[PDB]
Design a protein around this ligand. Structure first.
Ligand code: HEC
Ligand code: HEC
Ligand code: HEC
Ligand code: HEC
Ligand code: HEC
Ligand code: HEC
Ligand code: HEC
Ligand code: HEC
Ligand code: HEC
Ligand code: HEC
Ligand SMILES: [Ca+2]
Ligand SMILES: [Ca+2]
Lengths: 439, 439
């Protein structure tokens, strides 16, 4: 493609520093397993991909490796096989916009993750954010323009400051797969109403969109994904237009004394001076530990949330057993749907505590309130079917136990995934090395 | 007394600017009936005095007037009548440290509010904060010295920066009136655990303290009171040690062109440049806009919390009708107790969304979670007495309508007060002209 060059090596000894800082995101390679840490999430995502496996983010250099390796994507034995669609690559690779730019957007989205297997191979690279080129920014994904148009703030007409965050908005945002209406499943961002929780909620309701039917409570669910752009705008740095880049891609001096933009997107605190120091007179120990307070305040009210929702789901599990009708459970489901949605959005983004604490907290208030209604309605309903004794929740204090409780063959999935990892990945990169994309 | 001078005119034409900006708090004469504005709060204070009349605060100048006028204090006939005790004066006049210094704490805390009616006549003034003198700062009420000592921060050993804030910590706190063990009916700030919600909750629980038994729920309750200081201390400003004074009583310049210190404790945004502009480069409209947001995030959840607590109460009311045993109800009342305590502490300070909004939105979160547990227990219980349907909640959409549902004779309370207003108060002022305390 004449506009996208996905090979990330071309621009070394050419843009020396920027390639250098970009390659140092491989480095933060810590693979924190988030279910092992909080197994409630296994039961809230009962019935659905995230029940299987969910890790915290690591560096951009692992995007492709990580999408490949994760149980959710599966072990597909051919380009027609596999639970998930092409869309999955969209935010993992600068090969995406190459496919989009030649194939067409319609030709890129059609089929399965496995189809794009061999073609989407380079990790988040230069062409993802730049008009490479040569510097200067670019959106690269047409569906992303659409979402920015949709809230009334296109890229073309933004200030230099504005854009700095939009380039991240490409991926670090809540999405869904449209609508399965023939014409999609494209990646659309639910921002037509638009970006608050709240508005996103009415959007998905109005079109009755359901991410999946919950395995226990048979509730039509929404799943939130990393709403960094949407939560940022809500935070206090957000409203001052302190961009992603100010804190995440700061300007650092070369030894020679050349000032340039750090492309190592990780912790803004490593580069403390250069990030916070720019605008704050306090110390590293102080600002660090303030954010740790927030981190812990969110964490807290977060489990509280989870604890009711887990109790809500199983309490709905028993109602169906006891003989609840479709009509009897509809409102209890709605109430659960919202509560879990508001939980999930509140914390899918790992930096919410750092970005928009207050809002993060606002929405967990909102989630518990709704979990509340859910549970008391159920309370009254289980008694009409004769049960007036609290519902027993089995031991879910471990990933394995949570995954056992839901009837999941974990020793089969991992079995199949190593097969995929050894037999099928070698065949993919092999074909990708031969493409090259050589102009 | 020798250390205290309650007459506030004395030092006019002497510290003229400082008296004139002190008198100017007479200006916020605005009485905002909060019960009118939010009648749920009537139901939550059923049987307690705050259900009669609770108004938003106004000028320090009206401090004495409003403790005279509020229905809470009743209409006493003599020095030994009325529901409330002497303590209520403690934070309304520089006559308190007089009465403490002459009589002793012991001597001052002994008996009824009415008995102090002609003793306490000067409004909140110079001697409350100043070693009069002549300027310089002073604590004045010994129960404060003790509370400050309880948290690790004695006033003597305190920095100039702290003293600014601590002089307000004399009154703008959560307090309570001690045990009643023939040893104190003394004011004490519940800080031995110390200053968190949480810590205060465990303090009160550990000494089995209950401000009153809820009329509807029979729950042993606690009342939260304007904990500006405690809440301020958790907020982002308070951790940078930006003092109450820094925002509320700033430095300013007379027409003379003289740099005194602004004694009109009212609204920071009135002296915006001078207050906020000392540290922030952004604009009044932006900054007001942003606090205005937090107010609305606070308030929304304020209502979510209340609306559950209200149902919680009424539901418990019915467990009682249907013949619940004290044994069955203990687990539920402790839950409400805790649920309401937090709602209350959270929204008890009208400044909270300004000073400590993250924290206020945390505490409320944890309020709901508690009224969740409460309302689900009550559901089951109510079921075990053959109620499988929701407990109807009577029209409480008006201070009037709410107070009537509780059984309150408001026409018989306002009439009693007008005749105290009319026929007991001139007696109180006419003894304080005579008594003078003359120098
Ligand atoms: C892959 C190895 C690369 C290379 C070679 C470059 N980039 Fe980026 N870049 C991004 C942002 C937000 C800026 C700052 C915008 C601005 O200041 O105008 C830059 C800047 C550059 C430059 C200009 C010179 C400089 O460093 O200031 C150059 C030459 C450059 N980059 C090269 C954003 C991103 C990304 C978003 C995650 C990614 C990925 C890259 N850049 C990758 C690369
Ligand atoms: C534009 C300046 C940004 C900024 C500031 C961030 N992103 Fe991304 N990012 C993407 C993916 C798939 C991941 C997870 C990778 C994995 O786990 O394999 C991330 C991760 C991050 C982090 C965390 C890094 C760590 O060491 O823990 C951070 C701080 C971050 N991002 C910020 C995907 C993308 C994109 C798709 C092409 C683009 C564009 C961006 N990110 C842009 C940005
Ligand atoms: C603009 C929308 C963005 C995006 C896409 C991200 N950030 Fe930030 N961020 C900041 C701090 C201090 C943290 C956490 C501190 C810590 O390491 O404990 C984060 C966190 C993130 C993450 C998660 C990081 C992780 O791997 O756990 C991500 C994906 C992320 N950010 C992306 C600092 C800031 C800011 C300080 C003013 C600003 C503004 C942003 N980030 C903006 C963004
Ligand atoms: C020390 C520096 C301060 C600061 C910053 C404030 N106060 Fe007070 N205050 C007290 C009482 C009983 C009231 C209510 C008065 C009434 O309604 O009759 C108040 C009121 C306030 C306000 C509201 C002003 C407005 O215009 O709305 C404010 C902003 C305020 N306070 C801040 C009691 C006391 C004291 C007892 C002697 C002391 C000391 C203080 N307050 C100290 C401070
Ligand atoms: C006068 C009414 C105001 C208003 C409306 C605000 N401030 Fe301040 N502020 C100060 C410091 C050190 C911080 C933390 C930032 C940092 O560490 O550099 C803040 C922070 C804020 C916020 C955001 C945090 C929050 O509480 O939500 C807001 C909304 C805010 N301020 C508004 C320092 C000072 C002062 C030094 C004496 C002065 C005075 C003020 N601030 C005054 C105000
Ligand atoms: C240190 C103990 C204190 C105390 C006792 C008070 N303040 Fe503040 N305050 C600030 C702002 C912006 C508001 C909201 C203004 C509005 O929109 O109405 C408040 C509010 C209060 C109140 C409530 C007064 C009322 O009638 O609503 C009270 C009693 C109060 N404050 C006392 C500004 C600040 C600060 C800016 C950083 C600081 C610090 C403080 N106040 C500290 C204190
Ligand atoms: C942008 C709209 C995205 C699309 C669509 C998908 N992903 Fe993603 N992914 C995106 C971001 C911004 C991040 C990091 C932030 C975060 O909170 O994770 C990720 C991360 C992943 C990961 C690593 C984390 C993990 O779950 O182990 C994986 C394995 C992953 N993404 C897989 C994945 C799949 C299967 C997708 C199709 C459903 C998919 N992603 C889409 C951005 C976006
Ligand atoms: C380039 C500008 C900029 C930089 C970079 C920046 N801040 Fe801020 N920050 C601000 C502004 C503006 C405010 C609001 C204070 C004000 O009104 O001036 C603020 C407020 C804050 C707050 C209070 C708001 C909240 O989050 O609750 C914290 C904490 C904070 N900064 C910490 C940090 C940390 C930690 C970093 C690095 C992760 C950082 N800042 C980097 C501009 C910046
Ligand atoms: C140790 C501090 C303290 C003591 C104790 C205290 N007050 Fe207050 N009072 C305040 C402060 C500070 C305010 C202003 C903050 C507010 O009311 O929100 C206030 C406000 C008031 C107001 C005006 C607003 C209203 O309508 O409530 C009245 C009336 C009042 N108090 C009465 C009382 C009574 C009665 C008692 C005893 C039960 C009492 N006070 C005990 C400090 C105190
Ligand atoms: C609500 C508490 C409070 C009230 C009431 C109060 N003061 Fe002050 N005053 C302060 C504080 C705090 C300072 C700042 C002290 C410093 O700068 O060290 C101050 C400063 C002063 C100063 C020092 C000079 C200056 O302006 O910095 C004088 C003199 C003064 N006040 C006089 C008075 C007089 C006269 C009254 C009664 C008319 C009074 N104060 C009432 C708290 C109070
Ligand atoms: Ca989604
Ligand atoms: Ca109390």
């Amino acid at each position: 493609s004449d506009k996208t060059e996905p090979r990330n090596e071309v621009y070394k000894d050419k843009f020396k520093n920027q390639y250098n800082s970009w390659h140092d995101t491989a480095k933060s390679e810590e693979l924190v397993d988030a279910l092992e840490q909080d197994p409630n999430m296994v039961i809230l995502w009962a019935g659905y991909a995230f029940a299987k496996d969910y890790k915290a983010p690591r560096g951009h250099m692992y995007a492709v490796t990580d999408v490949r390796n994760t149980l959710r994507t599966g072990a597909p034995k051919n380009a027609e096989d596999g639970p998930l669609p092409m869309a999955c690559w969209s935010c993992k690779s600068p090969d995406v916009p190459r496919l989009i730019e030649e194939q067409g957007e319609d030709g890129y989205f059609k089929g399965k993750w496995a189809k794009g297997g061999p073609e989407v191979t380079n990790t988040i690279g230069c062409s993802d954010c730049h008009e490479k080129g040569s510097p200067k920014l670019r959106i690269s994904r047409p569906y992303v323009d659409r979402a920015l148009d949709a809230i009334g703030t296109p890229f073309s007409k933004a200030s230099k400051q504005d854009k700095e965050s939009m380039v991240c908005a490409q991926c670090h945002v809540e999405y869904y797969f449209e609508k399965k209406e023939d014409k999609k499943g494209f990646v659309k961002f639910p921002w037509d109403m638009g970006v608050t929780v709240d508005q996103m909620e009415v959007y998905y309701d109005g079109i009755e969109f359901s991410d999946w039917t919950h395995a226990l409570s048979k509730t039509p669910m929404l799943k939130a994904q990393h709403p960094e752009y949407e939560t940022w705008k809500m935070g206090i740095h957000g409203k001052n237009n302190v961009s992603c880049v100010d804190c995440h891609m700061p300007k650092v001096t070369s030894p020679e004394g050349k000032k340039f933009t750090d492309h190592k997107v990780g912790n803004p605190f490593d580069r403390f001076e250069e990030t916070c120091a720019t605008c704050h007179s306090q110390t590293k120990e102080f600002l660090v530990g303030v954010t740790n307070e927030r981190k812990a305040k969110v964490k807290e009210m977060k489990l509280k949330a989870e604890e009711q929702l887990v109790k809500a789901h199983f309490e709905a599990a028993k109602a169906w057993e006891l003989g609840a009708t479709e009509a009897e459970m509809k409102p209890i489901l709605t109430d659960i749907r919202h509560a879990q949605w508001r939980w999930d959005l509140a914390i899918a983004s790992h930096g919410v505590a750092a970005h928009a604490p207050e809002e993060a907290l606002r929405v967990l208030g909102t989630s518990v309130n709704k979990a509340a209604d859910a549970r008391v309605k159920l309370a009254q309903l289980l008694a009409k079917k004769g049960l007036t004794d609290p519902v027993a929740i089995p031991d879910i204090s471990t990933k394995a136990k949570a995954q056992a409780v839901l009837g999941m063959d974990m020793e089969k999935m991992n079995a199949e995934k190593e097969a995929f990892k050894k037999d099928m990945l070698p065949k993919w990169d092999a074909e990708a090395k031969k493409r090259e994309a050589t102009y």
